[PDB]
């Protein structure tokens, strides 16, 4: 749709910062599309990634980070709110402790900090998705 | 770039049709970008899917058929001719017993017919690539 994908946005993030998302899936669930989040600590796609947030449209999302190039501890969720051929609204939230999402206002899935969130320069949303919104919260100190 | 991505083109299919693809992945093989190609019966995505052709750049190629819904047995190649951050050109040949995969000019992978190629209605090409050239050779009685 409107928002060019890959999105590339430089970021920074601190407790109190939200990422919200607007888009839909490119196809139905049963040709399995994928969607993914990451926030990494530079511009460059090749750069480490302090959260890695995947979704397997109707099968599961997986949970990581990468951390000086090696891939961490994977964390796997079955749990899946997304909907068959719907627009998502995916919030992402800085907590002091861990990063909470939402899916249509419904909290989703939590990831524990391994890596502080100051450390996050850029967020890239990609995959098999369009989108129509992203913002990231600057109003806190 | 030029053609749009998810792309699908109506297509026949029989013995000497080739297939071919140019494109590029759209993020380094480290972020695992993927590539898909999919042989349909029909325009819908929902459709049986002859011939399933899905690249992990990087780690493995998995080729499958869907079959009034139902993914049948998994092909997987650990075969990796795609070459990190290139353009790629993809021939796919149209054999009497298989198709035949050319990647780069170089045979790669072969999936013998389970369906036969005449059933084919639609061709799909999606995920993490752009396109550049796409063509169904009609040369062929």
Redesign the interface.
Known sequence: SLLPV?YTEAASLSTGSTVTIKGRP???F??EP?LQV?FHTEMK??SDIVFHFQVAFGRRVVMNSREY?AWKQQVESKNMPFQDGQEFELSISVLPDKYQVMVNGQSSYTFDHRIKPEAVKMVQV???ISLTKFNVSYLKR
């Open positions: 890959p490119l196809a139905c049963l040709n994928y990451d796609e090749e190039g990609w995959r098999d």
